[PDB]
Design a protein around this ligand. Structure first.
Ligand code: VBR
Ligand code: VBR
Ligand code: VBR
Lengths: 412, 412
């Protein structure tokens, strides 16, 4: 009844690479992108490391002058978006531009821009605030600037669901296409919260790993010595496309997006319920949306943020949804390597789930030296595992109990 | 198949009142809610007035202790949301809680809280950043906190499309219900951008009226002496409900939501095109979505922000869409009275459009003393106009060239 939705283009900035192939090579190699932060004085901070984008040149995408108008999170979102559109080979024309939209989100948006303009405001007064402060800092300006640059006149919006943003953005973009509002959507997320406010904010909540002595070992999902998440920056974008449209132009199809689930925990502002009941409802919703039996799932890209409560809740949710099959599927947290890109986490992890299908390899959970009590599933400890993957699930859970699941399948 | 969506509950904080009835009374009376700002010293600012929420008591909704953790935009969004849910008479149960979701958005979210924590960080150090900085400031936490307080386990997300947020939030929530992801959604927007960075930021862009001597006269959509928008605070929430679900429980139905349009201008970061081409595309999309002859439109709640370029572009768009019928419909800007609530604008204006249907009256455009060149439509200058309204359209246009239109009609 609804139209089928396929992935024809992907783009990324991550702590592992300035594009998808370099990032994916890092993932399959078990490489960490976590390092002491260099771009700011963290002397007063209990966490002094994170996943930075290393060597990003915005001038490959924008003039210096246009880039100066935009927070880093918008620059990162545009870079991933331009990559994804180029990767798709899509030609935007007068005939189709009304059928091509964009939904690129962020969890936290323009903290670095706000910090910089704050400094000017407090030291000199409001006369020193940039004229571009508002349009250069608001979360919908990845969608806005991408649409202006490429001439996209389809649905133009942005989601902000904290750490679930990238997953929800991709899922709702798939709905736009499936139910006929667009033929193509650029969807995903971007984040740059490695500023005083980001590290300070999460630090004040005591939510961050403080393993400053061994940053590459800090992100250790399901390991008994985990002590909170690692803050990371970057972006992921997918070109989502109606199947008939993709086939008509001879698009290379990476995978099909067959399922999208949402749920609210309705439990706590930041903490998940012990049994992951909302995450379980969300995964079941995604599987029902895809018309799939739980036993058809081969690979789960976990939320797996390396928090004591979250990692255990996620094991409980998977055990509830999949029963005995929980022991047959493979589940890994690529955040073991990338850290937590917050709003961009679901976008880069959708891409890793699609590449898991393409290459038939489950990425590793690195740092899983001593699995905690009840963490007895195949969590792909230490090393990439070649295996059969017909169906891959990507999970994101966020503040406010907001849950999202995407289900991808090999394209037949 | 596409299910019908009705409005069964509404809630509001505005510069005209602390609920819908008091706000609507102010609208039909031609009252201004614009006044010199009292909550901060604006002596260094070019604009020193706006639409404040006057006498808001968060303790009518939340404990003092919980409220201290939450930016005003979250307090305002929860107040509107609790009002809307109470107004709907809906009882949340184990049987329906997975089918009730929330999409309450904001254009900039917790700017006041971020500014205050900025000041703590720069003046005193990161040890003075609030532990509640992130959950108290990020845009998705209206949806989060509402779901926690009421036990809502359905789709839980937030849109952020600058000044189009409230319109998009309602439209996409309607799609969730229409296509079966939920039976009920609480949808709308909230904004509190009246801090140094908000007033300073819009001020630096020269986007604000500087009529400090006569604040109640500053917002004058389509008047030749207009000189930019008036910044306003508050919130709107609607309970959207599947028609058969509403009928089954004997719900009071205000109106049906029959049409939703989106488009991108793909033109400029902040400015609309002179001919309002994107706004015209958006309205035509919404009218086709509603299965309507454009001649069925009786009343348009305009974007009408009181900017020289914006107001004219909107006249051009309406003339392009409606042709001769442009002279039969009534169009007014309630922003003449409320100012521009930014992300909440579309939410409060959806409510005013629904009440225009209920009471068969077009709200006035106050301050329209001397209509500009080509502003020769029925703009309901000065005084409310009783008239036949079967179909009401609400328009929102925003930064990034984002456009949204909602189409409401009387329900028997
Ligand atoms: C289940 C479902 C269908 C759907 C359609 C649209 C649309 O664009 O028409 C949107 Cl936004 C969200 C949706 N969610
Ligand atoms: C099942 C589940 C795990 C989890 C972890 C986090 C986190 O702290 O990263 C959050 Cl927000 C929600 C979660 N829900
Ligand atoms: C047709 C149209 C009028 C308009 C006004 C504004 C504004 O500046 O308030 C914006 Cl962002 C977009 C607009 N699009």
């Amino acid at each position: 009844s609804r139209r089928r939705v396929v992935i024809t283009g992907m783009g990324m900035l991550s702590p592992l690479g300035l594009d998808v192939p370099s990032s994916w090579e890092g993932i399959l190699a078990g490489r960490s992108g976590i390092a002491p932060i260099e771009h700011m004085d963290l002397s007063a901070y209990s966490t002094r490391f994170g996943g930075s984008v290393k060597g990003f040149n915005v001038e490959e995408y924008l003039s210096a002058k246009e880039a100066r108008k935009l927070d880093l999170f918008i620059q990162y979102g545009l870079a991933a978006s331009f990559q994804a559109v180029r990767d798709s080979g899509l030609e935007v024309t007068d005939a189709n531009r009304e059928r091509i939209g964009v939904s690129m989100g962020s969890g936290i948006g323009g903290l670095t821009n706000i910090e910089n303009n704050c400094r000017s405001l407090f030291e000199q007064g409001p006369r020193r605030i940039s004229p571009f402060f508002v349009p250069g800092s608001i979360i919908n300006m990845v969608s806005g600037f991408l649409s202006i640059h490429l001439g996209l006149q389809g649905p133009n919006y942005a989601l902000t669901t904290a750490q679930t943003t990238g997953t929800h953005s991709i899922g709702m973009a798939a709905r736009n296409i499936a139910y006929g509002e667009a033929d193509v959507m650029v969807a995903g997320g971007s984040e740059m919260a490695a500023c005083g406010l980001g590290l300070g904010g999460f630090g004040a909540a005591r939510a961050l790993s403080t393993r400053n002595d061994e940053p590459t070992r800090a992100s250790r999902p399901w390991d008994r010595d985990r002590d909170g998440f690692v803050l990371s920056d970057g972006s992921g974008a997918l070109v989502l496309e109606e199947l008939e449209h993709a086939r008509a132009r001879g698009a290379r199809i990476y995978a099909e997006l067959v399922g999208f689930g949402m749920s609210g925990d309705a439990f706590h502002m930041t903490a998940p319920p012990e049994d992951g009941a909302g995450a379980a409802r969300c995964m079941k919703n995604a599987l029902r949306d895809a018309g799939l039996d739980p036993r058809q799932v081969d690979y789960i890209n976990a939320h797996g943020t390396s928090t004591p409560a979250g990692d255990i809740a996620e094991i409980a949710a998977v055990k509830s949804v999949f029963g005995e099959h929980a022991h047959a599927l493979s589940m890994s947290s690529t955040k073991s390597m990338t850290g937590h890109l917050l709003g961009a986490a679901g976008a880069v992890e959708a891409i890793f789930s699609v590449l898991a299908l393409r290459d038939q390899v489950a990425p590793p959970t690195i740092n899983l030296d001593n699995p905690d009590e009840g963490c007895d599933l195949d969590l792909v400890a230490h090393e990439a595992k070649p295996r059969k993957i017909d169906v891959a699930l990507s999970n994101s859970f966020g503040f406010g109990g907001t849950n999202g699941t995407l289900v991808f399948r090999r394209f037949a």
